[PDB]
Write a protein that binds this ligand. Structure first.
Ligand SMILES: COc1cc(NS(C)(=O)=O)ccc1Nc1c2ccccc2nc2ccccc12
Ligand SMILES: COc1cc(NS(C)(=O)=O)ccc1Nc1c2ccccc2nc2ccccc12
Ligand SMILES: [Mg+2]
Ligand SMILES: [Mg+2]
Lengths: 778, 778
DNA sequence: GAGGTATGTAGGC
DNA sequence: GAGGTATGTAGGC
DNA sequence: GGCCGCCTACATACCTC
DNA sequence: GGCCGCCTACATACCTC
């Protein structure tokens, strides 16, 4: 087996005293290599002897769904391992390394004495992923196959400190493990002074002195897993065929460990499996839900919104083209993406992809290069080393307003600003965008709607001139949903049909019996048209019904001809029995594609919310835009009144400076006192000019006090009469804007109605422009 | 064979009409994939048929040195292919793809008709590497094995445009190929207006419309190689056992192609092999010489100096730690490194490595993580994903002064600033640093000298108080070299000895015949101590002379014990015959390590210069520092006189502003006219405050004219009397500094003598501090 | 005696 | 009739 | 995130005939 | 720069007895 170092005196007379170290990644492998090669000054410290090495290679499969538990009626319960589980390299490799056998149950001392290694230790990163997932699946598999090993403490793991705080003059850290504990320690402390906080989001982040200190006390910080009676049901709920069973368990939320339990764990290293599954595995599942379910407001996931934030920050200064990996590094460093690089590049490529049938109907990035056509479904995209991506500045600026991004709540990472909780847009992307995301307890499926029914719905909800406005409000208060919603017909030459409670997509075809050609210019919108012909190449008896398949379908279009026997038309017609909803030729070509919508979405707080129809999503997204417009108009009015009073103060100072003669003053304090005695209000102009996402109450309590830096910072060029006239004109313009804002807040329906109408018009104009081109605005 | 797409109708009746495309990298493979899958609207455009696909995988082996040409005395000349050439995957794979055989010579039509492909086309990037090297080796191998194929035009290649200039309103570019041609076109044009210049430093940089335009005229831009009578000697000189033969050919320089030759090439696509070898291969060889041979002044290579420039730029704002790949991306994007990423990361790791026997005696980066110990010679360094590097700010600032970097000449990349031509330091790194770099025609070997002989030499050359100053100057004018130079003893417990004209390094050992232990605490300075014991494990008859080898050598130290037979001492002593220069035990342990110095260095212009001894390097490096100090002092004096006159003007304006009353003025022009009529000189303060590497003549001709932006840009806070007093004190301080500079220019030996002495003292203090620690300054 | 074999490096592809 | 097999996506590894 | 081939320059055992 | 394993959720032929 590869990546397995055979330790000396292992699998022999001293095998029971040996230990085995399991690594989730090569970083842990390197850390273990350094620890083993340390050697000197470590008598109790484990050298390469009795240690060995095995790497889990990242994420391994769980045998809960692989087993079948068939033919248990013979009086004994036997589990048959599926061939998909048997041939996995990692699982059989670790089985061979341990020398264990599936059939035997190690209840007595000798049975576990035959094991090659006395114990197995799992060494993973302290981030939310890995511990809880990799440990979770590993020990769940161990419990499912050999519960006695967990019962007798054969399996164990080492627990590294996630966060360390070092005090100057002292050589020992706090070595805290959970972020809740670190927050409690920070808040219980009088102040965060004389302390250095170190974050270890990965084992390889530790230094040489850190790893040597860990290996000096390697006998400590190693915890043995203990099995309880209640662990079996937790394992079945968290892992297994039962899907809805874990839904009701995830919908509640993580329960923090009690103080007495933590004290017991720290005193003696016996970690129960139930507590680990309830804390670490549940937290990992919740994190996966958050990171894979797009927020209904954004219609896009956390990684996608972080990518959008990085693109907005990078391309704001210059819209010049940037390569994929440069942008990935930029968004990783600036926006604190501590997961990886390949996943980030893949997500960027998927977001920038644009072709008929693609997941992104309105990509946020204008891509240059070979992103792949509809034929491979984006699988034939080029390498990230050379693919070029640039931001769609017009579409983003008409779809995600700058002020809206200013007032959005932000996620704080290590006390620093990061991507907002949700980019609530002028139009809900959860409706336009569509994709299939299976997320650790829920499935996310969507189908695009036409940008005519939703536009009419929003216009009626906003514009009071629409006769359906009152009717739409009645529908809002009574869930009537008078206006219809239909699947988007863009980039689809077929016809959509509705039967019962499900929509269906049909391609178009032409039949020429004189030459026996089966032309299919249109095919279902989501099939890649290449895996489709592969499926039709394995379509059972249709091999005798056809001769061969020829593909002339190029990019941007589909055209496929099917060779078939001259006597095949009648037999396929009499065999397929065309129904009232689908054609016999459609059945032969599998042109029918039933579409299902699983509207599983996360609330801005972080909880799963389900929607029966898109109308619920729209009616839940609307009030957020209402509140954001109201608060944005209020903040604009407040900052404009501060700006106008500040500009009036500056103008009065410029007028009075002819006889003020402030040059004959000693320091800044004397000038400030003189100008205060002259009646000038002190304003923090560094906050007035650039509010920088300041709420109303905090902006007011910051503008109550201030300083005369605005007066003392103006140059010797702004005192000219031309500058004074320009400032007076700006005063008049901003006063007119303030009056316009004030009268906008007084409209009957709701604040910011005409603003929303203008934003809708601008964004639909930009969308139409992008439709006319191939999303390349040049 | 992998990465080989089998084209339809290939190797059959229509095989002679097929073509084969050879790609140097996967980027070219992807471009060819896009071109082949384009298909439609291209009747003459080649589809997947008759094309195939093969990859060269970048650099391949050259058969010129692999062949032996043995047993040619039988009346026929036969070349025996070495097994190292036969088992190469790429070579045998392409041989199998073509279906050719080594024994047969294809002179007639049928012999080349048996070939699977009618012709072979090499598709590589248009940068200096690839075309000239990959093409060079490929067609040299083809000529060496089958000259008739080149004679009959079997081998060919496609030539892509390196630089394209697009004119607005026109759809055709200039599609220029060589940078000389592009420069000639730019200089012959009246102006660079209404033109967009696009650089393609790689095939994948081309866009979809670019590649479709190329494939529309794929019949063009394909050039067939023609063999001449003189090509054989060029092939032998450029490739083969003859080493010195290519030295005299590289020492001359590249000869540009004549206009008539270029016109003939463009008119009919028959590229001679001699012209290609003389231009592209020679330019690639010169580029390799420049990029591999370290500049004698710098003591480091072009990539290393670009890395240092990137580190200086990145860490100047903040000395915070940065990961390896973030820094690599930063230096690639900012400093225009268009080669790759893995090589850059490897170079960064090698530069940041610090251990006994390492190449870098004074690393410019303070590294955090596992860079590897002396045992593996840096081969056990960790992954770049997690290795931490930070700049040694104190060492760099005391070794590479900021003003010196200001006045250094810079390399211009695409009209933008890049790394300087040479970082001439306060002490020549070519002496302290040492490494083994084989560079495409020359070998670079160095051995470190003690930082006591060179320090004394520089002090005597600089300080006039040293009694050897006049003697050292006499040596300079007469090559006497009175002062000695000895190998550095740092991190080496052994003793250096000199015999004849070569130094020798010996380790130390202890013998205890009572217990038969062979202890070796010290070993030669450059052997990795792990490959050494591997060599001694294959050391012929010494297997019978020993029993086994045990290694307790940890990091930072070496201790090895050798098990040997009790009756082995006398027999090894009587077998090895200890000489007067090395011991019998030293011979048994191979403790003697003869050191050779190949002082092959590139001039700042770019030419190879050889040095017989380190004294020549020192005496050539000294005048550069002399000139830089002289010009730096002159520039400082000039910029200081401009600064003092500007500050005096500002102070006079502040004094006069009490009664000036400039507020009653209309625009900036009126104020400028008034202040000019008041006698204020107009100075470009944006150049006076920050000169930004301005030469004396250009600084003077820029300071002759100017504007009153300095007067009009000062804020309303600098007019206080405290600011006036502070400015007066600054005036006095800079006047004193100007007087000090003026008296420094008048010292008898040379300008900047005491400055050099102080810089030497500071840099040696910093070096001593780094010696006391493990190059970790905390 | 003569010939053939194997890394060893940096900066590359 | 019943059971077993194979992707098919987006982020993670 | 790490398994495949060398390029150019070149002191050096080698070991069983 | 691209070959290896899946994780979670789940409409769906299937085909020869
Ligand atoms: C189990 O996962 C892996 C196994 C191997 N080796 S083997 C025995 O299957 O030949 C190699 C890699 C992996 N895991 C992978 C990743 C792990 C972490 C992060 C990214 C990964 N990306 C992978 C992509 C393809 C295949 C395996 C990957
Ligand atoms: C000859 O070089 C290569 C061959 C192959 N394939 S094969 C036919 O030998 O099985 C694959 C790759 C290469 N070349 C390599 C590289 C090429 C460009 C850039 C980096 C490369 N890094 C390599 C690292 C190891 C081995 C080959 C590499
Ligand atoms: Mg991790
Ligand atoms: Mg290249």
């Amino acid at each position: 087996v590869d990546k397995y170092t055979r330790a000396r005196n292992a699998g022999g007379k001293r095998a029971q005293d040996c230990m085995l170290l399991a690594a989730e990644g090569d970083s842990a492998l390197s850390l273990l290599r350094t620890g083993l090669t340390l050697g000197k000054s470590n008598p109790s410290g484990p050298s390469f002897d009795f240690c060995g090495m095995i790497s889990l290679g990242g994420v391994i499969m769980n045998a809960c769904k692989k087993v079948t538990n068939i033919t248990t009626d013979s009086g004994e319960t036997i589990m048959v391992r599926n061939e998909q589980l048997t041939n996995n390299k990692v699982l059989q490799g670790i089985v061979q390394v341990l020398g264990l056998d599936f059939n035997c149950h190690y209840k007595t001392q000798e049975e576990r004495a035959k094991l090659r290694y006395g114990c197995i230790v799992a060494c993973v990163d302290q981030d939310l992923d890995g511990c809880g997932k990799i440990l979770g699946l590993l020990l769940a598999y161990f419990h499912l196959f050999w519960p006695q090993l967990i019962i007798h403490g054969f399996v164990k793991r080492l627990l590294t400190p996630l966060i360390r705080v070092y005090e100057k003059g002292k050589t020992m850290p706090v070595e805290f493990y959970y972020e809740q504990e670190f927050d409690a320690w920070a808040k219980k402390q009088t102040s965060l002074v004389n302390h250095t906080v170190k974050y270890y989001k990965g084992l390889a982040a530790h230094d040489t002195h850190e790893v040597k200190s860990m290996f000096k006390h390697f006998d400590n910080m190693v915890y043995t897993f203990t099995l309880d009676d209640s662990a079996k049901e937790l394992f079945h709920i968290y892992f297994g065929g039962e899907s809805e069973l874990r839904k009701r368990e995830l919908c509640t939320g993580v329960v923090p460990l009690t103080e007495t339990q933590t004290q017991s764990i720290h005193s003696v290293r016996r970690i129960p499996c139930s507590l680990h599954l309830q804390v670490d595995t549940k937290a990992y599942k919740l994190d996966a839900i958050e990171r894979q379910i797009p927020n209904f407001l954004d219609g896009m996931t956390r990684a996608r919104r972080k990518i959008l934030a990085g693109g907005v920050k990078c391309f704001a200064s210059n819209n010049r083209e940037r390569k994929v990996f440069q942008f990935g590094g930029y968004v990783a460093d600036h926006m604190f993406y501590h997961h990886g690089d390949m996943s980030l590049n893949t997500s960027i490529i998927k977001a920038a992809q644009y072709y008929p049938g693609s997941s992104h109907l309105y990509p946020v990035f204008i891509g240059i290069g070979s992103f792949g056509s509809r034929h491979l479904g984006g699988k034939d995209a080029g390498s990230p080393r050379y693919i070029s991506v640039q931001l769609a500045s017009e579409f983003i600026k008409t779809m995600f307003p700058a002020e809206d991004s200013w007032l959005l709540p932000y996620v704080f990472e290590d006390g620093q600003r990061a991507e907002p909780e949700y980019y609530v847009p002028v139009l809900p992307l959860a409706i336009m965008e569509y994709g299939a995301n299976p997320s650790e307890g829920w499935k996310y499926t969507t189908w695009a709607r036409q940008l005519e029914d939703i536009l009419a719905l929003v216009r009626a909800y906003v514009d009071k001139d629409n006769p359906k406005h009152e009717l739409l409000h009645y529908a809002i208060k009574h869930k009537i949903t008078i206006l219809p919603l239909r699947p988007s017909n863009y980039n689809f030459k077929g016809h959509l049909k509705r039967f019962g409670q499900y929509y269906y997509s049909y391609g178009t075809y032409d039949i020429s019996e004189q030459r026996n050609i089966i032309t299919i210019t249109e095919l279902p919108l989501r099939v890649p048209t290449v895996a489709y012909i592969e499926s039709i190449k394995k379509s059972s008896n249709r091999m005798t019904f056809i001769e061969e398949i020829i593909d002339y379908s190029s990019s941007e279009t589909i055209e496929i001809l099917v060779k078939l026997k001259p006597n095949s038309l009648n037999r396929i017609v009499e065999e397929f029995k065309e129904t009232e909803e689908q054609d016999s030729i459609e059945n032969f070509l599998r042109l029918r594609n039933c579409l299902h919508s699983h509207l599983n979405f996360v609330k801005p707080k972080g909880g799963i919310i389900e929607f029966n129809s898109y109308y619920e999503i729209l009616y839940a997204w609307l009030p957020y835009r209402r509140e954001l417009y109201q608060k944005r108009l209020m903040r604009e009015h407040a900052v404009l009144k501060l700006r106008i009073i500040m500009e009036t103060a500056i103008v009065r100072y410029i007028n009075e400076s002819a006889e003020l003669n402030l040059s004959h003053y000693e320091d800044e304090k004397e000038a400030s006192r003189i100008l205060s005695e002259h009646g000038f209000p002190p304003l923090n102009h560094t906050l007035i000019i650039s509010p920088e996402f300041a709420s109303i109450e905090e902006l007011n309590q910051k503008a109550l006090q201030g300083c005369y830096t605005y007066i003392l910072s103006l140059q010797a060029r702004e005192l000219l009469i031309a500058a004074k006239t320009r400032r007076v004109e700006k005063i008049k313009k901003m006063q007119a804007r303030l009056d316009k804002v004030e009268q906008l807040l007084q409209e009957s329906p709701f604040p910011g109605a005409s603003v929303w109408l203008e934003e809708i018009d601008a964004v639909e104009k930009a969308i139409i422009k992008g439709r006319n081109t191939q999303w390349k605005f040049h």
